[PDB]
Design a protein around this ligand. Structure first.
Ligand SMILES: CC(=O)N[C@@H]1[C@@H](O)[C@@H](O)[C@@H](CO)O[C@@H]1O
Ligand SMILES: CC(=O)N[C@@H]1[C@@H](O)[C@@H](O)[C@@H](CO)O[C@@H]1O
Ligand SMILES: CC(=O)N[C@@H]1[C@@H](O)[C@@H](O)[C@@H](CO)O[C@@H]1O
Ligand SMILES: CC(=O)N[C@@H]1[C@@H](O)[C@@H](O)[C@@H](CO)O[C@@H]1O
Ligand SMILES: CC(=O)N[C@@H]1[C@@H](O)[C@@H](O)[C@@H](CO)O[C@@H]1O
Ligand SMILES: CC(=O)N[C@@H]1[C@@H](O)[C@@H](O)[C@@H](CO)O[C@@H]1O
Lengths: 133, 133, 134, 131, 131, 134
């Protein structure tokens, strides 16, 4: 029904690519992309539970949290050392979840020509598997 | 040593004014000011504990969290429906705490001429008392 | 709605004086008074929660708990190293609570002539309290 | 030590149980040892405290174990609002002692068919049986 | 039901205690009822499960209560890796029954001085004494 | 480092097949196999944590737990309605774990001729598993 507290690798179902903080960069504005599996810290996301049912995601060691500065269609998911966006992670199929912020679903954008693309908010076309680290 | 989980009114020691979400406005960018005591929801802050020792503050009913878009000297504390800034709430004297974001201490700005002023980050001149609601 | 577990300074709203174990004396029969703010151990009260909603208060380091040997109108609140009274801490206004024992509300008595006076129980809410996290 | 829970508390030396005399909820009611009944006045809720101490309260009656005068010879009673912080220390596997203010509880068997209140000594072990 | 904790488990009808025969940690070791010792092979850790069931494990020996064949007459044993999910239901205040697969545990008193393994019946109550 | 309490689909890395209670049969002696992903109840394993670090697995709704009647090399993993084996679930790589009973690692056996084969214990880590939250 819900994702329990723990640390996970987060794999997009449609592309088999993993949620990835670009270059493990801890600076604000660093895009959260989907990338080939590495299992490194910038692909390990700590899931923090909140009493209202929402979730927050933070990278191990880097300590940059999933953050969206402007919650509107097309807004980009980034990593931020101090700011975080409260997310709604809802089950769609057994073992497959959607992630949304402010009612807008996360859309996985596969890399193009070797350059990763930030996850964006759509106006569920992207599902995610939460694999325990 | 630390502020435990709970809902609090947060009174600035130096001015006896309370942390207040301006006009109870739930929109992003709404300033967090200090204001005369009302005890209404925009002055009731839920303190959420995190395993790393940080804290996050959310208004009751309004559900806007304490959020700082740019963590630099002079940056303003606002309320945001979906975003939140992880804070460090440290004891200074018995019953008196400092609040900081990204290592920068919160500075209480008393209202001027009837207009509230947003709490800002200084480069501890502002202490806070956490009163259980 | 309720006071969560923690350690608090407890200030009387009507007088801005703090719940205070007189002279920090750990002996039985030591009055719990209201006194000027100090922030010392005899003004730090550990709030212990009970499953029925009641609360118990104990001073930090001194380890003397709020205690009422005779729960009747006029009875005095003291500190006791081994005995304690289960209290009902009820919200009256946002951020302002009343304290009662056996259904009798705590009454704050301000000092007279530089001498503190014990909190007492009023007959069957003239005193309210602010719980300030230590 | 004894974990949080509700127990029947039987004295080892007598096989008699901690008993709030007559299920009387008023202050001053003696805490005695009595033949087993299993009723509410023999069901003691053990509450844990972070300093390691314990407090006991009867089920439904809501009278807690209380010692007004914590000196040798003082009597254990039940009180609807007041309670005494106790130390319940393991002596043998499955057998515990109870003390208030460093003074051990002493189980007093009935004299002439009438119950006698537990007293503090300046000798009595207890088995905590989960209700 | 029985809360989580470590207990000595005494059969009411015999006053004998649940006992891992000879403290033997190997599979197939009988779970018997035996005279009180208080040793590790009589200390049972009660683990709670969200469905209401319970599992028992001996302290230090780490052998859990296990029933290979859950049918009338099946024997209760200790096993280092396998365990049987049990239902421990209150019958009277302070007295519990134990069952596996809907079949009650039956305490078997020693025959000729030798312990007899607990068996499942198609009659035995237990007191959980906190260690 | 460890698998937290929850309900998981458990996929074998080397074959991308999922731990599967054959035919969802709740009877004792029913093999635990690896099978094509379905997401059904017989592929949903509740992970119960134990204070010593061990773990137990139980199918949702069917209520049959992972069980090894004979813990030896070659012994088969089954589902059992009332008996269960305490397991050691150890991290090998990030996101990839091994499962073992009595110190013997679980070995995934892929189906042959459209017939599933039971997970077995290898002699004293050829099989790894991904725990996917349901
Ligand atoms: C080790 C490390 O930081 N790896 C990252 C990788 O995970 C991905 O984010 C990539 C984007 O160009 O940048 C780096 O190579
Ligand atoms: C009830 C309500 O929203 N009150 C607020 C008050 O708390 C303060 O924020 C003020 C700033 O001008 O605006 C309103 O009056
Ligand atoms: C440090 C200390 O014990 N201070 C106390 C103070 O808190 C108050 O109780 C006063 C009453 O006359 O007695 C002392 O000075
Ligand atoms: C039911 C009930 O309160 N029974 C009590 C019993 O427990 C014991 O206290 C006895 C002392 O004379 O008085 C009554 O019989
Ligand atoms: C210490 C120890 O294991 N003692 C056991 C005892 O508990 C009981 O199992 C008996 C059966 O013959 O065998 C031994 O004496
Ligand atoms: C729904 C159901 O029980 N499905 C199972 C499937 O999961 C697998 O175990 C297969 C083995 O032949 O048998 C059945 O079809």
């Amino acid at each position: 029904m819900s994702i329990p507290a723990g640390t996970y690798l987060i794999r997009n179902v449609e592309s088999n690519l993993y949620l990835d903080l670009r270059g493990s960069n801890p600076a604000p504005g660093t895009d959260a992309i989907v990338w080939g599996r590495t299992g490194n810290n910038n692909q390990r996301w700590i899931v923090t539970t909140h009493s209202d049912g929402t979730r927050t995601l933070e990278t191990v060691g880097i300590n940059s949290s999933a953050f969206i500065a402007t919650i509107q269609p097309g807004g980009r998911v980034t990593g931020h050392p101090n700011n975080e966006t409260r997310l709604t992670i809802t089950n769609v199929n057994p073992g497959e979840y959607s992630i949304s912020a402010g009612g807008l679903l996360w859309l996985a954008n596969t890399p193009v020509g070797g350059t990763g693309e930030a996850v964006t908010l759509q106006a569920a076309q992207s599902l995610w598997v939460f694999e325990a680290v």
